[PDB]
Amino acid sequence: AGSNTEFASNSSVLSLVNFTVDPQKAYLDFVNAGGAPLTNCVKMLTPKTGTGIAISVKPESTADQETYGGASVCLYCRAHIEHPDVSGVCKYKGKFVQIPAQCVRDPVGFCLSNTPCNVCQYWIGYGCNCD
Amino acid sequence: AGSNTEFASNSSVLSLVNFTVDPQKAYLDFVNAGGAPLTNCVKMLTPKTGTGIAISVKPESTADQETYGGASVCLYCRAHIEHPDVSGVCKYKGKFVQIPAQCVRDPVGFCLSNTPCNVCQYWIGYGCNCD
Amino acid sequence: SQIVTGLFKDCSRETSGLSPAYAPTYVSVDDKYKTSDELCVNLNLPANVPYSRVISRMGFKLDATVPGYPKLFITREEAVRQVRSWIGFDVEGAHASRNACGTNVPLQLGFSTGVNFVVQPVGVVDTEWGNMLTGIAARPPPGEQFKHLVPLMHKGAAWPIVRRRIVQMLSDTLDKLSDYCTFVCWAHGFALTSASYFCKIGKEQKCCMCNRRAAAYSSPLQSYACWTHSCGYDYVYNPFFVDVQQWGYVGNLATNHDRYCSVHQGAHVASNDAIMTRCLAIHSCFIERVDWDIEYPYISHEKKLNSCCRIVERNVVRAALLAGSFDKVYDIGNPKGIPIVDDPVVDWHYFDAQPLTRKVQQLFYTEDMASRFADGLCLFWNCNVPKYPNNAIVCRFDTRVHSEFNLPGCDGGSLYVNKHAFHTPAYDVSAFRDLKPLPFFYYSTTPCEPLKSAVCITACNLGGAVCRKHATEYREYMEAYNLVSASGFRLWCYKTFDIYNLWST
Amino acid sequence: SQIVTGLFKDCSRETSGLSPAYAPTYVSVDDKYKTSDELCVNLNLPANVPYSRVISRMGFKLDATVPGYPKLFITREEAVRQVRSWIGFDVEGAHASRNACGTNVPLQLGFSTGVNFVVQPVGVVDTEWGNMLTGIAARPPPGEQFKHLVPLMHKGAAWPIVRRRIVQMLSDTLDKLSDYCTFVCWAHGFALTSASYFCKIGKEQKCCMCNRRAAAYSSPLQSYACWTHSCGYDYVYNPFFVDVQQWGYVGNLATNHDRYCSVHQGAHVASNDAIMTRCLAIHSCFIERVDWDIEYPYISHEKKLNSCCRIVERNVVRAALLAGSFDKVYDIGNPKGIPIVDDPVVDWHYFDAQPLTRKVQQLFYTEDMASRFADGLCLFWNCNVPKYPNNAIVCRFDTRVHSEFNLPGCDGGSLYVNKHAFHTPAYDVSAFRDLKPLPFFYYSTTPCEPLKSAVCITACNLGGAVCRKHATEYREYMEAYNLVSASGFRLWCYKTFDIYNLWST
RNA sequence: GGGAAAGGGAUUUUAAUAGCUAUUAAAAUCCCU
RNA sequence: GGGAAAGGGAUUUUAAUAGCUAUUAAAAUCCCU
Ligand SMILES: [Mg+2]
Ligand SMILES: [Mg+2]
Ligand SMILES: [Zn+2]
Ligand SMILES: [Zn+2]
Ligand SMILES: [Zn+2]
Ligand SMILES: [Zn+2]
Ligand SMILES: [Zn+2]
Ligand SMILES: [Zn+2]
Ligand SMILES: [Zn+2]
Ligand SMILES: [Zn+2]
Ligand SMILES: [Zn+2]
Ligand SMILES: [Zn+2]
């Protein structure tokens, strides 16, 4: 019964995240130690004509970005664990995430390490200009 | 086997003291409410020619005092409960206690309410002079 | 007076009494010191020091009255109102031996929760500098029946650990039920002596972290807390005590309990005796003599459960009256004789074991009385009978479902406390062998003003559709039915019941 | 490359995958969105919201290696070194039903302490705003053998309470034994899934209140503590996991355990399976294959106990050799072949099951070899034989005595851990039917330089007196004997042993 | 469970799609429930 | 217990001391261990 969802290569890191107290630090330590990043992310085909904001309701990637499904690039959705955000609601689910092309290797690490600017909704240090 | 030690009339209050968190406050409340004071105290026959200090190694009552056995006028020895003194050692056991004649009704209440002066070893407000 | 008591008896083997400066009472002084006028004298004899005399704790009496201090040895009427706090309590003890003879110390404590705590032999020792609560020599009681206590002498733990374990167990058991603790004992003479080891009393206190009544006391913190905040607390604060033997019982515990219960049989242990004690107390207070005037406070959605039970009763009784062509209805178990439903015009009759109105006839139902009511539909809403008739509609509480208003009872049954205490016999599926479990369904006749389900017997479902009114009614009835069933109630019906006969409207 | 796993399987009944903005993986997306180049597209279709899909937790693998993170699935040798942390663990589960199909959730957890916890069916539910750990529909497993699980579906409590109860139980059990926890399981595939509910892992931490290793984690306080400071803590921190089935066993747990043990028989429950698992692990690691080189750390007064045991052995063997004037001594159970006493000139011989020196012959003792050593004095100091001869001097550990260095073992026996691990068979008095219990006594020959006792066989006691040297010798020997006996050791001797023969000196 | 849609894995064998493997579907043995 | 000196109470009866009671000592019944 049911239908399979995850590859066996991601099972070790996802179990580690499922058991750890702090999933973000554990995943960052796993990636920085040479472990394989999370594969099986949802990648979107876009004409690269978007505005380029971080999180959007429809794909908005520019020529220097790639659009990903939000739920596939959130560590708490991948591991199916409780989100730490306000009222337990994920900010990535139902929305598409723009990832810079230079960091296409590990979308989950980028979405954990960086946060968008609250004024212009771009990634800080990766497109945000507020000076 | 064994030999009896306490009267039944004292069996009520001594039970209460065996259970209360604060034995001194409970005994004072029991006495002040009209309950019978603890009987069966050891009273010593003295020629009334002593110095009159509070606690002594031999009987020292004056004409206005009466000598009692210390263990019989300590509430924690009557109820057989842990003493609150320094290192758990009773200050009354092995020594005789002088009680003023005007408070001969309740020796235990007097020994719980008052405290000897550390300089001249008389009862404060009952023979102590340190002005 | 001069009537002596066995409390604080000197259990040492020394024949001579103590010197006046060391003896706690007058009659404990050696006779060589006593003189006329009931006075003692100092004879300048050498002091017999050091010494170590075991002091007995047998014969406590908590009957003193001090203002601000609650009455702990409650009566029958006060114990009934505190039924949610009832925890059974038995103690098996060891006799002091070697340097001490004449006292008992607790060895195995048992509670109605089924747990047993084994402790090292610890008693009060009076020494020349004061007194201690330390280890003393003790042997298991002689005879055959106490041979099972022989291993337990070397399986006991330290008292400060066992205190915290007892407080933790009572916190786990009684947290959701009450702010109080009530030790139900069979003979309190030794139970109170053992309770002196792990209980403290005093004025009524408030919890440090919340507004609940303080039921536990911590000595290193000198603090009071309720059950939710009693982590690491040594002592139980202000427990009530109840003696079942004072209630007119004659004979030992086993012969009195075996007359009314056959479920608590087993090996001899303190916890099983505690369970038997609590079972006998429940039988005494809620089966043999029943008080209808004692209302209990609401603790968890009792009003909503009552409303849902009334809704489900109305629906299923109307449906049972309309599916079969019954013109005569018997209600066995209606205390007041108020008709549950009146939309189908049928001839109602009421019976009850203890009717509150002359309009209701008396009926202590037995299975031989089936032929007296075989011509009508029998109703058994919360009426318990060991063998139900063929044409019955029965609602019965399943005693095996864990609920906050469900408590363990007598003979495997349970005490259900919802504004009143009802003793329900143990749920046995053999009583309903002539009946079938009633399937879930809804029936309505309200006017019409997505949801796909074949058990919604309505006007819209005949045409394959559903309306907003019937959808909301069906959802709220599903909520009511779910609450009723999850509380524990089970519904059974006569065999010839078919929902497809309800499609006539 | 594309090996799929059952972990995080979508257990809902929906026949279509999720939208690309909501699906957690690529292969969980519905096929109408995917393209040729393994890309996904947005078709501007209406969103299928809200939704609720159960997510499976079956198939966790804790085999990743991160610097600073301890290895939790330890090997055989590390499990042996951590024998004091061994807690058995079994889970009985319920199958997800109704809206879900294809996963199991824990229903009854059972530990080797004899404790069972019943929980409500709780699983992970993925919804359009995130995910929850909430109640799901679940039924007991079908078949006859799981009928006993049918009542337990309505006897379970909430998970946040059961977490704290489990942490409290583990703190109560493992506080004095170790700073670690080691779950000994028979099939870790479901045990690890259940452990994901109440365990947390991470870097090795220090307790907030002391220097002990942190073994529990509190979420509301966001803190770490050891066993003594884990009051109110709801998570177990860094537990090791051990699988007995990986150690070469073939067949189910019951047939493997019943081949080596007959004591743990009983009704089927999770705790009894956990006890059988731990018993089988003990048999595997300490009876069949034994490692003599593994040394365990000292906890409390173990060196003192060894010194007292040597003193008592010297005194008892010297006195037993001098009484009866034995000339030949056989020492059955001496690994090194070092004589215990040498003041009486007797001919010593040594035997052992696994001798460490060629001077010691092999001897796996059987009662049929009683006549092989009938012409001397046999020695059984910590040598365990089901049937002892008539001429024996035996010291045997009583496994029924609770001690820090005494752990539960196989076939009713016990594991005694004092610098080494010895498996001792269950203490049965029937093995000593030809021997009498040795009474307490003392013996000495030291030159001399109040105390009344008739068992102090000395030069002064012959004349009815006692000296200071023999007084302090007798008192320190009493302390040593008391420590040895309170640790659990019992001494037995041949029937013809009379202490009055020792008065010859 | 009071509650239509009876669970998870390992090994072997079989058949199909795709460019010997991955997935899909079935049978047999064993373990967990 | 591995460990010489076998426990607590209620009721009834009997004997002694002192001026019907308190203690001491014993027997029978019942309860706890
Ligand atoms: Mg009992
Ligand atoms: Mg099992
Ligand atoms: Zn998320
Ligand atoms: Zn900005
Ligand atoms: Zn004192
Ligand atoms: Zn002064
Ligand atoms: Zn509180
Ligand atoms: Zn019963
Ligand atoms: Zn309608
Ligand atoms: Zn600590
Ligand atoms: Zn076993
Ligand atoms: Zn000497």
All residues of chain D having their beta carbon less than 8 Å from the beta carbon of residue A77 are 24, 126, 130-131
User: Can you tell me which residue has the tokens 């059972």?
Assistant: D110
- Cβ count near C243 (within 10 Å): 20
CB C2 within 8 A of CB C27: no
Alpha carbon B63 to its chain centroid, in Å, reads 19
Secondary structure, 3-state, D205-229: CECCCCCCECCEEECCCCEEECCCC
Whole-number Å distance between alpha carbons of D379 and D381: 6
All residues of chain C having their beta carbon less than 8 Å from the beta carbon of residue D401 are 154-155
Identify whether residues D343 and D229 lie together within a single domain: no
Residues 6+ apart with CB under 8 A from C178: C82, C84, C85
Residue D180, both tokens:
């670690």
- Give DSSP secondary structure letters for C70-110: ---B--HHHHHHTGGGEEEEEEEEEEE-TTB-S-EEEEEEE
Question: Considering only CA atoms, which residue is closest to the C1' of nucleotide F7?
Answer: C95
Which DSSP symbol is given to C287? Answer: I
**Domain total in chain C:** 2
Identify whether residues C187 and C333 lie together within a single domain: no
User: Would you mind telling me the total number of residues written for chain B in this entry?
Assistant: 131
Identify whether residues C365 and C251 lie together within a single domain: no
Whole-number Å distance between alpha carbons of D175 and D113: 14
Alpha helices in C265-382 (DSSP H): 270-283, 302-323
CB C46 within 8 A of CB B65: no
Whole-number Å distance between alpha carbons of B69 and B48: 15
Distances (CA, A) of C456 to C444, C445, D187: 8, 11, 46
B88: left (phi over 0), alpha (psi -120 to 50) or beta: left
What is the dihedral sign for C-alpha C236, C241, C242, C245?
Answer: positive
Whole-number Å distance between alpha carbons of B41 and B72: 5
Alpha carbon B21 to its chain centroid, in Å, reads 20
Whole-number Å distance between alpha carbons of D252 and D275: 15
Query: Which amino acid, residue C297?
Result: P
Using DSSP's 3-state secondary structure scheme, residue A121 falls into coil
What is the dihedral sign for C-alpha C253, C256, C261, C263?
Answer: positive
CB D470 within 8 A of CB D460: yes
Q: What is the largest CA-CA distance in chain D?
A: 112
Residue D61 C-beta-side C-alpha neighbours within 13 Å: 16
Identify whether residues C220 and C313 lie together within a single domain: no
User: Can you tell me which residue has the tokens 């942490």?
Assistant: D167
Listed resolution, Å: 2.9
Pairing label, strands D442-443, D456-457 = parallel
Experimental method: cryo-EM
User: Can you tell me which residue has the tokens 């106990």?
Assistant: D305
Residues 6+ apart with CB under 8 A from D453: D461, D474
User: Can you tell me which residue has the tokens 């130690």?
Assistant: A33
Q: C-alpha angle C253/C259/C260, rounded to 5°?
A: 100
Identify whether residues C421 and C496 lie together within a single domain: yes
Whole-number Å distance between alpha carbons of C425 and C269: 26
The binding site of B for Zn(2+) comprises: 74, 77, 83, 90, 117, 120, 128, 130
- Torsion angles phi and psi, residue C407, rounded to 5: -130, 150
CA–C1' span, B36 to E21, in Å? 97
User: Can you tell me which residue has the tokens 């690994």?
Assistant: D335
Residues 6+ apart with CB under 8 A from D177: D84, D85, D299, D404, D407
CB B7 within 8 A of CB C1: yes
CB C241 within 8 A of CB C192: yes
Residue D73, both tokens:
């699935």
Evaluate whether residue D32 is within a structural domain.
Answer: no
CATH code, domain with D247: 3.30.420
Distances (CA, A) of C247 to C90, C187, C241: 17, 11, 13
Q: What share of chain B is helix, strand, coil (3-state, %, to 5)?
A: 25, 15, 55
Whole-number Å distance between alpha carbons of D389 and D495: 11
Identify whether residues D308 and D385 lie together within a single domain: yes
User: Would you mind telling me the total number of residues written for chain C in this entry?
Assistant: 505
Whole-number Å distance between alpha carbons of A26 and D223: 17
Which DSSP symbol is given to B3? Answer: B
Evaluate whether residue C475 is within a structural domain.
Answer: yes
In angstroms and rounded to an integer, the radius of gyration of the C-alpha atoms of chain A is: 15
CB C398 within 8 A of CB C427: yes
Which DSSP symbol is given to D318? Answer: H
Which DSSP symbol is given to C431? Answer: G
Whole-number Å distance between alpha carbons of A33 and A36: 9
Q: Is the pair A, C in contact (3+ CB pairs within 8 Å)? A: no
Identify whether residues C242 and C341 lie together within a single domain: no
Whole-number Å distance between alpha carbons of D63 and D40: 32
User: Among residues D228, D253, D288, which one ends one of the domains?
Assistant: D288
What are the beta bridge partners of residue C110?
C90, C116
Select from C385, C350, C347 the least CA-distant residue to C364. C385
CB C11 within 8 A of CB C137: no
Q: Which helix (H) or strand (E) holds B23?
A: helix B23-32
| Dihedral of the alpha carbons of D195, D199, D203, D206, in degrees to the nearest 10 | -140
CB D109 within 8 A of CB D91: yes
Q: How far apart are the two ends of chain B, measured CA to CA in Å?
A: 56
Identify whether residues C251 and C315 lie together within a single domain: no
Residues 6+ apart with CB under 8 A from C481: C308, C312, C440
Select from D240, D203, D251 the least CA-distant residue to D224. D203
Evaluate whether residue D261 is within a structural domain.
Answer: yes
- Cβ count near A21 (within 10 Å): 17
CB C54 within 8 A of CB C99: yes
**CB-based contact B19 C199, cutoff 8 Å:** yes
List the domain range (segments joined by +) for residue D122: 76-288
Residues having C-beta closer than 5 Å to ion ligand 4: A 117, 119-120, 128, 130
**CB-based contact D402 C231, cutoff 8 Å:** no
Evaluate whether residue C328 is within a structural domain.
Answer: yes
Residue D476, both tokens:
């320190």
Residues 6+ apart with CB under 8 A from D358: none
Whole-number Å distance between alpha carbons of C358 and C337: 9
Q: At what angle do helices C159-174 and D159-174 cross, to 10 degrees?
A: 170
User: Can you tell me which residue has the tokens 């206690």?
Assistant: B97
Q: Which helix (H) or strand (E) holds D389?
A: none
Whole-number Å distance between alpha carbons of C129 and C127: 5
Whole-number Å distance between alpha carbons of D92 and C70: 47
Alpha helices in D117-195 (DSSP H): 159-174, 188-195
CB D215 within 8 A of CB D233: no
Whole-number Å distance between alpha carbons of D109 and D271: 7
**CB-based contact D151 C232, cutoff 8 Å:** no
- Cβ count near D165 (within 10 Å): 18
Identify whether residues D185 and D245 lie together within a single domain: yes
Residue D135: nearest nucleotide (C-alpha to C1'): E1
Whole-number Å distance between alpha carbons of C280 and C112: 12
Whole-number Å distance between alpha carbons of D321 and C101: 39
| CA-based nearest residue in chain A for residue D100 | A2
- Torsion angles phi and psi, residue C97, rounded to 5: -135, 180
Evaluate whether residue C42 is within a structural domain.
Answer: no
Distances (CA, A) of D179 to C302, D114, D133, D225: 46, 21, 30, 10
All residues of chain D having their beta carbon less than 8 Å from the beta carbon of residue A78 are 24-25
All residues of chain C having their beta carbon less than 8 Å from the beta carbon of residue D231 are 231-232
Rounded distance from Cα D487 to ligand 12 centre (Å): 30
Residues 3-42 in A contacting D (C-alpha not used; CB under 8 Å)? 3-9, 11-16, 18-22, 26, 29-30, 33, 35, 40-42
Evaluate whether residue D296 is within a structural domain.
Answer: no
Whole-number Å distance between alpha carbons of C479 and C312: 10
User: Can you tell me which residue has the tokens 């005490």?
Assistant: C415
Residues 6+ apart with CB under 8 A from D200: A19, A20, A21, D217, D235, D236, D237, D238
Residue D487, both tokens:
């640790």
Select from D413, D331, D436 the least CA-distant residue to D380. D331
Identify whether residues D171 and D149 lie together within a single domain: yes
Ligand nearest to the CA of D225: 10
Identify whether residues C333 and C450 lie together within a single domain: yes
Residue C419, both tokens:
């504004």
Residue B19, both tokens:
């259970």
Select from D315, D298, D301, D169 the least CA-distant residue to D231. D169
Which other chains touch chain A, taking contact as 3+ CB pairs less than 8 Å apart? D
- Torsion angles phi and psi, residue A126, rounded to 5: -140, 30
User: Can you tell me which residue has the tokens 């942390």?
Assistant: D85
User: Can you tell me which residue has the tokens 């799981």?
Assistant: D146
Residue D332, both tokens:
């059955």
Select from C296, C199, C177, C192 the least CA-distant residue to C243. C192
Whole-number Å distance between alpha carbons of A92 and A90: 6
Distances (CA, A) of A101 to A113, B96, D228, D245: 16, 94, 52, 48
Evaluate whether residue D434 is within a structural domain.
Answer: yes
Whole-number Å distance between alpha carbons of C118 and C97: 18
Rounded distance from Cα D438 to ligand 8 centre (Å): 46
Q: Is A128 annotated as a binding residue?
A: yes
What is the dihedral sign for C-alpha D12, D18, D23, D29?
Answer: positive
- Torsion angles phi and psi, residue D458, rounded to 5: -140, 180
Residues 6+ apart with CB under 8 A from C407: C83, C84, C86, C414, C415, C416, C417
Select from D92, D146, D144, D151 the least CA-distant residue to D116. D92
Residue C90 C-beta-side C-alpha neighbours within 13 Å: 21
Select from C473, C402, A8 the least CA-distant residue to D154. C402
Using DSSP's 3-state secondary structure scheme, residue B99 falls into strand
Residues 6+ apart with CB under 8 A from C478: C442
Evaluate whether residue D65 is within a structural domain.
Answer: no
User: Among residues D288, D310, D328, which one ends one of the domains?
Assistant: D288
Query: Which amino acid, residue B79?
Result: A
Q: Is C17 exposed, middle or buried (0-12, 13-18, 19+ CB in 10 A)?
A: buried
Identify whether residues D401 and D369 lie together within a single domain: yes
Pairing label, strands C235-237, C199-200 = parallel
Residue C431, both tokens:
């009583």
| Dihedral of the alpha carbons of B73, B75, B80, B86, in degrees to the nearest 10 | -100
Select from C324, C326, C319 the least CA-distant residue to C340. C319
Whole-number Å distance between alpha carbons of B125 and B113: 12
